[PDB]
A paper describes a structure:
Neurotransmitter:sodium symporters (NSS) constitute a large family of Na+-coupled, secondary active transmembrane transporters conserved across all kingdoms of life that includes carriers for a broad variety of solutes, including amino acids and neurotransmitters. NSS proteins transport solutes by an alternating access mechanism, based on transitions between outward- and inward-facing conformations that leave bound substrates accessible to the extracellular or intracellular environment, respectively. The transition from outward- to inward-facing conformations associated with solute transport is driven by the transmembrane Na+-gradient. In addition, it revealed a structural fold with the first ten TMs arranged in a pseudosymmetric inverted-repeat pattern with a central primary substrate binding site and two sodium binding sites (named Na1 and Na2) in close proximity.
Here we present the X-ray structure of [name] in a Na+/substrate-bound, inward-facing occluded conformation at 2.6 Å resolution. The W8A mutation combined with l-Phe binding enabled crystallization and structure determination of a state differing from previously determined conformations. Overlaying the l-Phe substrate with l-Leu in the outward-facing occluded structure shows that they superimpose almost seamlessly in the binding pocket. In the binding pocket, F259 forms a π-π stacking with the aromatic ring of the bound l-Phe substrate and F253 in TM6. In Na2, the coordination of the bound Na+ ion remains trigonal bi-pyramidal, also as seen in the outward-occluded state, but the coordination is distorted by shifts of TM1 (located between Na1 and Na2) and TM8. Consistent with this notion, Y268, which forms a cation-π interaction with R5 in the outward-facing occluded state, has moved into hydrogen bonding distance of D369.
Numbering used by the authors:
A (entry chain A): 13 to 510
B (entry chain B): 13 to 507
Amino acid sequence: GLILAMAGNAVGLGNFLRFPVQAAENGGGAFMIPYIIAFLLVGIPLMWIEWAMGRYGGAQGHGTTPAIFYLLWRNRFAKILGVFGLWIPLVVAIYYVYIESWTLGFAIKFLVGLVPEPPPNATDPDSILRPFKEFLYSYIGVPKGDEPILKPSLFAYIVFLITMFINVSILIRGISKGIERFAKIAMPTLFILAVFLVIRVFLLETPNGTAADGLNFLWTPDFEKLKDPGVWIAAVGQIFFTLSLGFGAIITYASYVRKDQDIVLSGLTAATLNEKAEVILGGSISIPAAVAFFGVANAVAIAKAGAFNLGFITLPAIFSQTAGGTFLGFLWFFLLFFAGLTSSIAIMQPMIAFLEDELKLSRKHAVLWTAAIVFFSAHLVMFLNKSLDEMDFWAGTIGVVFFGLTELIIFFWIFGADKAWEEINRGGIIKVPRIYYYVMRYITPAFLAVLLVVWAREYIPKIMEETHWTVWITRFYIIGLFLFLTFLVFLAERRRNH
Amino acid sequence: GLILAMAGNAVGLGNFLRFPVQAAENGGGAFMIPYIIAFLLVGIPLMWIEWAMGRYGGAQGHGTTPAIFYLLWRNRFAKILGVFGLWIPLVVAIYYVYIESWTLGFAIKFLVGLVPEPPPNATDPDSILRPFKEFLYSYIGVPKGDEPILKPSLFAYIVFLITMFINVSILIRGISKGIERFAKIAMPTLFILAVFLVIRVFLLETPNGTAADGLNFLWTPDFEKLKDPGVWIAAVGQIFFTLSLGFGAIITYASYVRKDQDIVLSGLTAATLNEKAEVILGGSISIPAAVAFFGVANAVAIAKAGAFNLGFITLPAIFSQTAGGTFLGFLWFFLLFFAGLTSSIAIMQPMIAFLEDELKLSRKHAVLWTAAIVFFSAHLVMFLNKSLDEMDFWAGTIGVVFFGLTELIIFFWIFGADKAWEEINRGGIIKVPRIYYYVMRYITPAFLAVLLVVWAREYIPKIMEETHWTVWITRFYIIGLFLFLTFLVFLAERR
Ligand SMILES: N[C@@H](Cc1ccccc1)C(=O)O
Ligand SMILES: N[C@@H](Cc1ccccc1)C(=O)O
Ligand code: NA
Ligand code: NA
Ligand code: NA
Ligand code: NA
């Protein structure tokens, strides 16, 4: 199935770790209403856009974003906007591989038996949260008092090295046959273990809450929080993150596929299985269990205190109250690691492809230098408090929605609305309904543009008053990354005409 | 002929700002004894070596250290060590241009009469230091109490922009005939002004000290601190800095010289001319006056609190007591600005020369991108406390004594001492005395290698115990710059 490779990179850490965080910190229910609208009016059509843009420029030997933007709009300002097609995946990879290494480190701990346990006599939210919170915080090195320096354990650093070595050895060697035999075993195993864990979580009855309260917290909307654009832009950004949109990823992969081929039905199918994997499996396992085990206030606080910490704290609590949970926990975090592994090798693909097709580097050299830029930068994420969340906000939330609007104007307003409508439907098994045409030309592009404006007039004053230097150094570091990548595209521009 | 071009290279901010700080920071006399030894055993021989390597490499179209090292020694490790010939000039330029902008800002202050004045009815050495300390600290934004974030004035930021604009213009359009007409008037005027100031300083007496006490501070040796390797490595590092050695700068300028011109006489004349402007002019004005005005305790404390601050505090105190001092303060800081301008366009030369010969960028593009890296990186030294001092130590002190040793190993142990001796003395008006053949081949490398080791086993443990996050981020940043420049050299080969 060709829809499984389109969802093998879509289903990853965003489904089981980022979604519970994004939903619980933004309210739940108040977050789900725009999250559904973003999937219909924004997420689905942009999937059709990036596959159409990619195979269009890919038919002329262009797999990189600046080369395709300039092919769709001949202007040096288009190649500058194409740098986000390299900057966003690079910044996300700086922490994504690190979060991926957390799942491998937890899998090794569960296999060997090092698991967190609830206290003997607690039966109150903060006391039973402490063993599971300290299990994660002492691994990633969270101190007390909001001190800016993290002290991760030596085991966590070594597991990060091993995770980098696994990503590099696959990007160089390629997809192996044993990996293909392991992938066809992990896809049912993940979507069978997920079935049991939805049943297990549903009958959770604790003195601190019920799973029914977690589903009540997640599916009852608060309409006064719909006036908050930070809730809206967190929802439209999570849609882009989970669908692998707003990066430079999908446009690079359609460059390697063929024209006169279906990008409509298969593009709609992988976008649905992915939402089935995180709304049902990623959303009704982690969130209701956190509300049942720790209550609402503590579940929201854990979600606000990190970008991926909720699932790492909630799932071991489930497995501590389940017969054989230590074994199932090994399966959970090892399969979650494989989900992140197939995504991280995909996130780092546009950067490696740029060093190949534009700077004429070999596979071995393009991979190893890309890994050097990720490993070196990851030390900010590993050792600076809130540095990981900052990269996740500007690349994984704000960056994807700005770069998603940019794609929707270059391809649908400058390249031609009717001209782009033909590129989407070519070879389609089914046809895109006519109502999406007016949505892609007048509704969605004139909605993301308004959201970023109504958001920036309210939160940018709060952002520029940031007091933590660990945050400003991260903002300074990622600006240097965008300038560094702009310099690389310049070296490619003075090489094509040289 | 070309001696004045080497003197516009050498004579700069290291002569009048850094040398007073480096000497007063380690004591003086205890600093000058290894300083004179470093000029004879290290500075002079490595001046001839960099000029000889540049010619031999420039004759084949190479002007940067990664390509010239690989030409003399065909190894992967040669191009990696050649990155320092790009990294040290880049790191130094990150803060050198900013220090250059200070002299321009003070020149504008003194032109319009915004001068610091000592308080009346007070001879307290802390009360008279206070307004001169505040004049600099309010400009560069030093807070009270070791806070990590600097807050320099808006005027200091705008003047930095203009200093960047002046460097970019001259680097693109070249040295105009109007400013070449200016250099022949400015550098003589600076020498005449400095000879006047040392006469003025020598006639200083205060209720807190005299200038004769200052000369006793700088020239009376202390033999207990002669066993401190940090003092030895600061004197050797200063010799490299003031003579423009230990960079890839002299090698790039030598890459345009014919292989049959004179190196020995012209290089020895420029080095000695530079030292006269440093110990006789720069060192004899700032330090004796700081001791006379503020005392020895404060002169050492100011030298340790910053990397270039002492000259900016001491000199306006001199001008506050001299008739016509505000006008003389204008000419001093303006000719000090021009002395830094001709030096900073030479510092950014290896980076520009690497973006053209390799990577095949135009002159307009190589200057603007080099100016972008420097301008971006300068915000660390502008806003993070002790970041400027950290870059100045690892590049301007430790890096130069390491890269100078590296140039010496590859040219006299790998390329061949008999071939290098033939290449230095080729076309020379006079010949190098035979005693330097054994200094270059045996004495100098055995001296620099030992000095680096004994320094590293007495100070690396204290370096790893840093308590300021602002210095670890600077160390993290400059490691990133070296990896970045190693990536560009890699892109040069596979082009
Ligand atoms: N969509 C993936 C992340 C990803 C983005 C871009 C390319 C590949 C993967 C996730 O939710 O985990
Ligand atoms: N030697 C100069 C600095 C410099 C170094 C290298 C090249 C050019 C200038 C000084 O003392 O100020
Ligand atoms: Na995946
Ligand atoms: Na996903
Ligand atoms: Na000098
Ligand atoms: Na100069």
